[PDB]
Design an enzyme around this catalytic site. Sequence first.
Site, PDB file in Angstrom:
ATOM      1  N   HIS D  90       0.800  -1.217   0.000  1.00 17.84           N
ATOM      2  CA  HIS D  90       0.000   0.000   0.000  1.00 17.84           C
ATOM      3  C   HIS D  90       0.839   1.277   0.000  1.00 17.84           C
ATOM      4  O   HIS D  90       2.069   1.231   0.075  1.00 17.84           O
ATOM      5  CB  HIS D  90      -0.931  -0.007   1.217  1.00 17.84           C
ATOM      6  N   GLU D  96       5.624   7.749   6.958  1.00 23.72           N
ATOM      7  CA  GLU D  96       5.332   6.761   7.984  1.00 23.72           C
ATOM      8  C   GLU D  96       6.568   6.472   8.814  1.00 23.72           C
ATOM      9  O   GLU D  96       7.625   6.180   8.270  1.00 23.72           O
ATOM     10  CB  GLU D  96       4.794   5.466   7.365  1.00 23.72           C
ATOM     11  N   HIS D 135       4.807   0.371   0.267  1.00 21.21           N
ATOM     12  CA  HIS D 135       5.497  -0.513   1.192  1.00 21.21           C
ATOM     13  C   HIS D 135       4.598  -1.614   1.715  1.00 21.21           C
ATOM     14  O   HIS D 135       3.404  -1.651   1.423  1.00 21.21           O
ATOM     15  CB  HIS D 135       6.055   0.293   2.365  1.00 21.21           C
ATOM     16  N   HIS D 269      11.018  22.484  23.849  1.00 17.95           N
ATOM     17  CA  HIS D 269      11.513  22.313  22.486  1.00 17.95           C
ATOM     18  C   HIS D 269      11.319  23.587  21.674  1.00 17.95           C
ATOM     19  O   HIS D 269      10.218  24.117  21.573  1.00 17.95           O
ATOM     20  CB  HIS D 269      10.832  21.108  21.823  1.00 17.95           C
ATOM     21  N   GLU D 274       5.691  18.388  20.396  1.00 20.59           N
ATOM     22  CA  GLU D 274       6.097  17.064  20.835  1.00 20.59           C
ATOM     23  C   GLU D 274       4.901  16.149  21.002  1.00 20.59           C
ATOM     24  O   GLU D 274       3.940  16.475  21.703  1.00 20.59           O
ATOM     25  CB  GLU D 274       6.864  17.105  22.167  1.00 20.59           C
ATOM     26  N   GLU D 327       9.450  10.351  22.498  1.00 23.39           N
ATOM     27  CA  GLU D 327       9.246  11.747  22.119  1.00 23.39           C
ATOM     28  C   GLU D 327       9.311  11.874  20.606  1.00 23.39           C
ATOM     29  O   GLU D 327      10.340  11.586  20.006  1.00 23.39           O
ATOM     30  CB  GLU D 327      10.298  12.645  22.763  1.00 23.39           C
TER      31      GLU D 327
HETATM   32  O1  LIG Z   1      -2.186   2.406   7.143  1.00 24.22           O
HETATM   33  C1  LIG Z   1      -1.469   1.649   7.863  1.00 24.22           C
HETATM   34  O2  LIG Z   1      -1.967   1.071   8.867  1.00 24.22           O
HETATM   35  C2  LIG Z   1      -0.006   1.431   7.516  1.00 24.22           C
HETATM   36  O3  LIG Z   1       0.533   2.134   6.606  1.00 24.22           O
HETATM   37  O4  LIG Z   1       0.667   0.550   8.124  1.00 24.22           O
HETATM   38 CO   LIG Z   2       9.898  17.297  25.603  1.00 21.17          CO
END
Ligand SMILES: O=C([O-])C(=O)[O-]
Ligand SMILES: [Co+2]
Lengths: 376, 376, 376, 376, 376
Positions: D90, D96, D135, D269, D274, D327
């Site tokens: 997909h 990601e 991927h 930061h 964060e 974080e």
């Molecule tokens: O959409 C999702 O769950 C992924 O890309 O792993």
């Molecule tokens: Co922090």
Amino acid sequence: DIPQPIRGDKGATVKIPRNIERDRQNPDMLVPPETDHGTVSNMKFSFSDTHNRLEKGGYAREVTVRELPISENLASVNMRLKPGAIRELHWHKEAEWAYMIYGSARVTIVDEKGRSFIDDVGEGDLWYFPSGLPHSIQALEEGAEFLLVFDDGSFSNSTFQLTDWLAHTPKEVIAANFGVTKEEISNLPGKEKYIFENQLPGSLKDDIVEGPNGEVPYPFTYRLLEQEPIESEGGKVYIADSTNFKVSKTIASALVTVEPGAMRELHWHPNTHEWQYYISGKARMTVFASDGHARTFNYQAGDVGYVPFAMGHYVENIGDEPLVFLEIFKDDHYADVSLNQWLAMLPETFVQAHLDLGKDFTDVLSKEKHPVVKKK
Amino acid sequence: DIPQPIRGDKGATVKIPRNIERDRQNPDMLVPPETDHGTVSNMKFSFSDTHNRLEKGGYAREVTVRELPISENLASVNMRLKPGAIRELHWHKEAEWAYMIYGSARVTIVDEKGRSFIDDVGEGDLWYFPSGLPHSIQALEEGAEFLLVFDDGSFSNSTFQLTDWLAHTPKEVIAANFGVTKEEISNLPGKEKYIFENQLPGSLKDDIVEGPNGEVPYPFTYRLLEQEPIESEGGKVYIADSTNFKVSKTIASALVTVEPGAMRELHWHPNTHEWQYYISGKARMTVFASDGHARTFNYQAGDVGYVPFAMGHYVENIGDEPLVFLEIFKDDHYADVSLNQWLAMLPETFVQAHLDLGKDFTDVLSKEKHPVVKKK
Amino acid sequence: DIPQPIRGDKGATVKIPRNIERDRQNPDMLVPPETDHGTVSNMKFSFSDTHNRLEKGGYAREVTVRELPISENLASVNMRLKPGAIRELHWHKEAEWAYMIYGSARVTIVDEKGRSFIDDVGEGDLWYFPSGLPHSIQALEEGAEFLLVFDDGSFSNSTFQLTDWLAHTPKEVIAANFGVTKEEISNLPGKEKYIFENQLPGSLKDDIVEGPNGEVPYPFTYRLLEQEPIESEGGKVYIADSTNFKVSKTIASALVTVEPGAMRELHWHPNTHEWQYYISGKARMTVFASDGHARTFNYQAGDVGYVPFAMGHYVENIGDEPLVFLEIFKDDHYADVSLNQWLAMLPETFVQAHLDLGKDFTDVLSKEKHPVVKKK
Amino acid sequence: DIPQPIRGDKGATVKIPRNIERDRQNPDMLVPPETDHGTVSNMKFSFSDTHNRLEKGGYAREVTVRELPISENLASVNMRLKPGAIRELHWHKEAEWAYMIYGSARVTIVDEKGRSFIDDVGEGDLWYFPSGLPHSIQALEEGAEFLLVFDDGSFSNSTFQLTDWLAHTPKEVIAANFGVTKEEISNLPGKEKYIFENQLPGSLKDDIVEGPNGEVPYPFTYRLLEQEPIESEGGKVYIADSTNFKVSKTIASALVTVEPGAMRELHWHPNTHEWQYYISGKARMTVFASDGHARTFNYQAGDVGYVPFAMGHYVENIGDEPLVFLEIFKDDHYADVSLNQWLAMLPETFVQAHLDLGKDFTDVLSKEKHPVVKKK
Amino acid sequence: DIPQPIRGDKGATVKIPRNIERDRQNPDMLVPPETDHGTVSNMKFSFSDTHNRLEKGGYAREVTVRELPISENLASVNMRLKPGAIRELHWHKEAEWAYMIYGSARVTIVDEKGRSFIDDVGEGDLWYFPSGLPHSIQALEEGAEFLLVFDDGSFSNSTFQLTDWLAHTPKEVIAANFGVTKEEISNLPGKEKYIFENQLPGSLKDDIVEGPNGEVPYPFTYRLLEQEPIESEGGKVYIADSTNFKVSKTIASALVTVEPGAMRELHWHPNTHEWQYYISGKARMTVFASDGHARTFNYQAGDVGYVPFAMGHYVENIGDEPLVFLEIFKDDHYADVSLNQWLAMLPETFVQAHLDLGKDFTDVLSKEKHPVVKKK
Ligand SMILES: O=C([O-])C(=O)[O-]
Ligand SMILES: [Co+2]
Ligand SMILES: O=C([O-])C(=O)[O-]
Ligand SMILES: O=C([O-])C(=O)[O-]
Ligand SMILES: O=C([O-])C(=O)[O-]
Ligand SMILES: O=C([O-])C(=O)[O-]
Ligand SMILES: [Co+2]
Ligand SMILES: [Co+2]
Ligand SMILES: [Co+2]
Ligand SMILES: [Co+2]
Ligand code: NA
Ligand code: NA
Ligand code: NA
Ligand code: NA
Ligand code: NA
């Protein structure tokens, strides 16, 4: 004496109670050029029209998008400190730019690698503090008054101060953080200070804190008036942007001096919006907004002006003293297109075809750029 | 002489070029009450700070959301006509409210059933034109100067005028529409007029156009100053909303007179925002914005003020002449809550518990409402 | 013991650290119905997951759009007062609705004509305070705990309290307003109180303040549980909206009781969104969002639920105790469409054609509405 | 046993049905620090409070802006795969990022030049998939459970899967695309798979697909726990951003371990917001939001936290086991300002002037940064 | 033959590949009136330019804000049913308005009190379904083709159908809801139907379902073409709004017939925006947008048009067949201002002063309104 809104056979005398004194300040608005046309947003606000915040140690007032809606990306503070007086250690989301108008001040900054920068800033000097890096300002013996610019317009002061943080942190946690007892910090301020009176510091070189992380790569201060200006007939222009003032990534600036009988030439900016502060003098500016839209404004000391992206404009001195104002840009570089130089670099007959004029006009065009020109 | 921003041991003298004349206009802003606190949006703009549009026949200037961003629902025009002079037949999306400050004028309106209303409007009179209904204004012999309110803030003049429509309609179509030739309308204006010089009309009764559709149900004019005001110690209040000025569905208004040494009492509005125009006098007002936020403003002739929905405020005369200003609301009715009357109608001890004060305070509370009160 | 997200041959055991105790609270979320499908916004938040504000006299916590983004038009407060304790005299932009869950309290309200209403409110009673009208709450001897609803979701408490106003008003002005000296009010609180300890009041009839303006037209309190409910097999429904609780113009409500083995039937609302508070019991609800989108949630005491406009839903008791929850609507009336009654009022064969079922189904349909039904 | 919201003389016992079990999870929310103040947005959500999507092969649940409105730029998925099980080939708009918490998995990615990357990812390993690059994930023999981050918050799964595309493409077109017949692809799935059961793969080296375009310039996997951490007294910090994990242009990360009796120091930061995931342990964090605003939250395994840009915070272990959390930053680099190191690098007396404390405090300040500190 | 964009000495022949057939459809766009000026949003879209959804039983296609961005408040569907064919029982957030162009259909509706309305709708008939009330459509023996309007523009079909709900409800719950077994409803459709083939119904009177709740107060159908039209020289106008079609609270409509050589007169609407559907014929319309802005469009069968609030317009027949189109308004009433009648009801000389014309023009003005006029 008493100005009226009358241009030839247009207009009429005011017949209701009115503010004659502001009318006198805005001649080109009570009586606009014939050539003005269309609806244009306000590009003009006065610091004297804002709430002055008074503290022990000085004052601060601000022009923001809540005052001047057109300026969404940029806001400003007029800040005044008395001698010794400290603007409290703090940090913002927004980056911070400054011009020192009166006096002098010592600043501290520490970056994200724990390297510190401490320096003294005089009249004509700038500082730039990157987003989120903590800093402070302390006025020296003359005191200090400076103009601040922040690269967001929604900016109220809305700032993080050191003692406001600790006052709203559990004492339990502060102690653990530093490895002391609750009692050892019983006397932490229960409230922010912001600006407060203090004794004058000593020599700068005695304050320089040395650390294991080293010197910072680029200074946070810039001596603007010690650089060779662009000198043209009617004035001087001093430019500082990311190309010469390295850390100034998000603010490009110009200090413009215009002699009497002179003007900042017809030009525009191809990169972004222009934010203006008028330091001294009196001026008028017409903003050309395209599609036959144009509105003229008046400016004097303490006024903020604005020119939306790419709009055509000029800045003309209309009084007896020199005109001194700042051109500010949220960008990493300064850029302008000169109307003169543009037409100068095109074929003679091509320009003639456009303007319905002859060689007696194209002959005056100059291929060099003269930001500030003088009359005849 | 020269005011400085100094309150006791807070503040400092101004050290940069400055606008002393505006400073003198805003004493409560250069030196705010100790009790002021927090970030509050600007609630103040001056018509003298706007581009005056000059025509043959008069002028018009406007304060809009582009000038005063807080006022999103309401905008205003200061319009001036010379004798005989016509504000051109036209229509808007926005409804139109007016107060006749100087002179007199004749207005026409025709509604959606083809019934016409023609009337003469003097000093102290109002008109209200519903959304989209076409109208016009013609100044009589003294000329005319009036304040206009429209119930949208994004309102530029952005208006539909009769000759602008026909100038941008195919002549072919106009002819077919009326059943004439192209030549019979060869002389239609090729451009809008907006405001133009014209001869004084005759008697009103000679202009009254009669039609098969009949009289309109409710008049579009209101004689405000011929109604019995609410009279209290320090002044007068004249209210006109949809309950007495029937057609005024979307605009509620009050004309407030405050004598010297008097004030429009502490109160707020439970229905909606308040828009203000200062006709004459000098004033200060502190706006209470909740959560310990408060900002004080100064107003005089030609200024527009604003009070966001439900925020606590007072309007105090700070000069030698009477204070005269308009309270405007985008709503079908006027409503206020008086601080005095509120506490007056609660149990004595309950109020005492709240304010940490005794009977010597609750004894002064009044159960009648006095919009405008006088000092001691 | 230890629940896993496994439905037949779908799912798997959790292999990372996890919150078993919440998992046990949300069985229909850790293991959703096969019939669930698609992306649906969260409709579930717990007051136990909010910052509790603690004062001398009680506490207050709130669920807002900052907690539950789907609910833009409605926000809620869980407020607790100790005996005698006062929620400080105040006012909001938003209208205020309440259900008294525990204890009792005395309320005051004064409207825009200076008429006051003071009343005692018990368990099962409501109040509704129109927008901008000032009010207060004082717990009686048992103390008080109640649920508040306000018809805006962006609502933080962000409220105007009486002593916060006066603390941020110039003393000069307050004095002039009431006609006393600065010294006579030297002891005004320098800070808001919000909630504070106080002595129990006396009898209600001794607190009733009489005024020249008269009785208010409609009461601000409603005895919900003293009305005859809609009684069906599995429960009771008590409805209060603008039709029976006159002043409740912007809030329509239902208290729903569901016995064990019962359910609030399949239905939807044709007027507007539904906001839910779960008073006691445990429940599940599937929200049908159209286009084959459906998501099931679990609720118990202290949870806020939500059903966007017109979305199909049911509310089913899944524990041993009765299920008691509030249905809240920002509207002037209550309305629902019952799935049963809908199909009941259509031709038998028409419904059969739709559902691929026979007379053995259409025979069970009822033309009367039964909000709450019981199993077999 | 039974916690109540009571701090000294503030608060009161709960008198309505309630969720004692969540109350026990949020001690610092049922009873907040005295130092907490003001309205602050929710910074806390639990995966156990989300709909678990169950498939043959595992599950997936998500926290998004629809759950946690404050996090507009970042969203997360908790994904679980059984052995052999495939998360279907997909692609997304969003980039990601992943942390492998349990087990191991094989991933494939192919970039825009047709170069493929196939690798095995263990516990403590990361992957980063640039925006729009396709991927897949396949769990190995232990199965796999991992945390996913995507750099948009409006992200539902809303993803493009390989078989969903082909199922909604004309068979005519697919055939022409590959140069086969309609019949040769009669058996294409008529529906997406998303997650599905499959046989365990073989050795990685046997799966490596070789191509004419060559090796990819930078790997898409990073062995986080095999790098030398920043080790301080109370814990470890492992940082991975675009400077060491080259392809991770839009996600900067830190894995923080905090021993019992330790804390992630006071810091903020300067670059951006964060986003937090709590892997194991129990914690509290107070967020300092400026202008005297502060709100404290509780976190444990399965919770998502958040800290808006530049806001001051600490993360303190409040249980018996180590505290382990991530974080996450939408940025090309990690950056923090330490409260300690800041003050350490300023003049001694300057800091003293600010905090109203002496040398006994400035003596403890350290010029080195210690992200995680331990108590006494 | 081949049209070119040439008006006198303006324009030029097209020199690139082009769509001659659309050019022929838009003569007044390829060659606009001289009087056109300025940037105006598209007011024109064709149903033939939309994806036709094909089902067993018919089709549906829609024009929405995603097609025609100017129309934010209104969207439309062209729906076709075969004989017997059912548009599935369903409900929306949006109210629904319809015009039956071809054929006939039977509709059912049940309101919020469980009262049902079942009626047959022929050519020229309307229905209006209030927001959220469930309904259905079944074509009779000729089949049916009708135009639907919904009072939101973001409206995709995005609709709640009866079997989509039940398919995404736990069978467990459905059973409990109706008091049957899981097995008794094993055959519920696993998927929505939307539109499906079915046998022709019987007589209407045999389908009328009687209930304990009674007759509905106002019918949901309106026989538009059986009312006496406004007849003027060049055509007919049939108006239906909330004043005669009572339940049609949010949709006002007019069916306009224009003979050849006729036109819908110059007028505008003072209440709100106008949405247009062209049923048959060919037309042009110029939209006057104020400030000298005007754009002309061409329309024929199957086109949607639009006129923003208060903008001046005319609708002129430019072919050999009658022009038939719908004027649709999101409002509770129809209203227009006629240019003719406006000027007719003003003083003769006043109009003359405005238009620079004489009595030979004012003499033709009519005080009666003639929506549709004819040429000479
Ligand atoms: O959409 C999702 O769950 C992924 O890309 O792993
Ligand atoms: Co922090
Ligand atoms: O100086 C500053 O940074 C300020 O005023 O917020
Ligand atoms: O008077 C008016 O309506 C205007 O100025 O637009
Ligand atoms: O009770 C109230 O009105 C509140 O909590 O703001
Ligand atoms: O007819 C309808 O309501 C539709 O098409 O959604
Ligand atoms: Co410039
Ligand atoms: Co007021
Ligand atoms: Co419901
Ligand atoms: Co029309
Ligand atoms: Na032009
Ligand atoms: Na406060
Ligand atoms: Na579907
Ligand atoms: Na503060
Ligand atoms: Na024009």
